Design a protein around this ligand. Structure first.
Ligand SMILES: [Mg+2]
Ligand SMILES: [Mg+2]
Lengths: 218, 218
């Protein structure tokens, strides 16, 4: 069934320490958006995140600038930070920006818990099927794709691609959305399309709106 | 933009007369489901319907048994009742079950205000594109199609067919849905797919749930 993913994004240590866990009571999957920190504070802030959310599963996500994130890193810095956090903290899942940082993907080959991710804020690309195929054939823990529609048909394409790949790979977990106001319908289509990880806020949708929609759709 | 269609379905005259119009305040399009009456009471009940809803546009719908309705009529009886109601009352729109009563469609050729309708409660048929094409090429006032999905892909097919036909015929108004719990997503997809007439209740969805969804999608 559907899994709700809620982000945690402290900008410093005093903030991370100060987080209210009761805010996350309805959620068992936490995404630490480590890109909200300066690169030199990520490892310092990790203990607070892992200690606070010890009751939940934790995703380590270093969302980099080319993928819409708040940190600018070389692919080398990127993989080095991921591996250091991994070696010490053992996050349940690790986000890897497959296309942006493909040059260092060979360093990540042995990980069974990757969320292979791809975000396109410009368009729904003409080779989207090929992107699904390449990511799905790797059989990561999750295939995560977010694309910007430039027409209503773009939104339907995202939905139909997810359904086709899910039907061919029923054991593969997907988190796929069409972004923007235009693509918002796709955010409530996970049960139809085969997208089971739902990224929410506490285009973008809150947990409250999600619940209300899941109500009507059951 | 979207038009909400609310049904009126009295089973006798005392009932029709007794209807509370304030229930329909948010709605400017009324569907008189005349099939809830015995055939010999439809014309007797019409004055009450047309007088009560004089402020709104009115659809005359004789939904027959093979299309999921509450009356059993020959195609001849069907067209005769429609034409009598039309001659006296001038309904703003008339529903015509294009496939079920095709044998008498020649009698309806000159009407510019038809809702050509098709309901399949068994499946999403393999020639659905052909059904869209035949109905759309007639350029009725509305093409109305409701089909039962037997898989998630069936729901997406209904949605993609509507979008393709809408894009090719942007002046054509559509009212298309995938039925059941499975197809419920399609009921909130009208803006994406190009379905602008929304049939509600006061799978099936109420005006209240609709409003709440239109809120989130804008
Ligand atoms: Mg380890
Ligand atoms: Mg007339």
């Amino acid at each position: 069934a559907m899994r709700i993913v809620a982000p945690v994004m402290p900008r410093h240590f005093d903030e991370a320490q100060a987080i209210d866990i009761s805010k996350y009571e309805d959620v068992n999957l936490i995404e630490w958006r480590a890109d909200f920190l300066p690169k030199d504070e990520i490892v310092a802030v990790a203990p607070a995140i892992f200690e606070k959310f010890a009751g939940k599963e934790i995703i380590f996500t270093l969302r980099t600038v080319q993928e819409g994130g708040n940190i600018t890193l070389s692919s080398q810095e990127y993989v080095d930070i991921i591996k250091e956090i991994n070696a010490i903290y053992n996050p349940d899942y690790i986000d890897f920006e497959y296309f942006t940082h493909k040059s260092v993907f060979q360093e990540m080959l042995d990980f069974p818990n990757l969320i292979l991710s791809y975000h396109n804020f410009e368009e729904t690309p003409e080779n989207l099927m090929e992107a699904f195929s390449e990511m799905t054939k790797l059989a990561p823990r999750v295939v995560k794709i977010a694309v910007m529609p430039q027409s209503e048909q773009d939104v339907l394409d995202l939905m139909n691609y997810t359904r086709g790949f899910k039907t061919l790979n029923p054991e593969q977990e997907f988190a796929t959305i069409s972004m923007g106001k235009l693509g918002r319908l796709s955010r409530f289509a996970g049960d139809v399309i085969g997208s089971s990880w739902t990224y929410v806020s506490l285009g973008q949708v809150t947990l409250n709106d999600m619940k209300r929609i899941i109500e009507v759709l059951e």
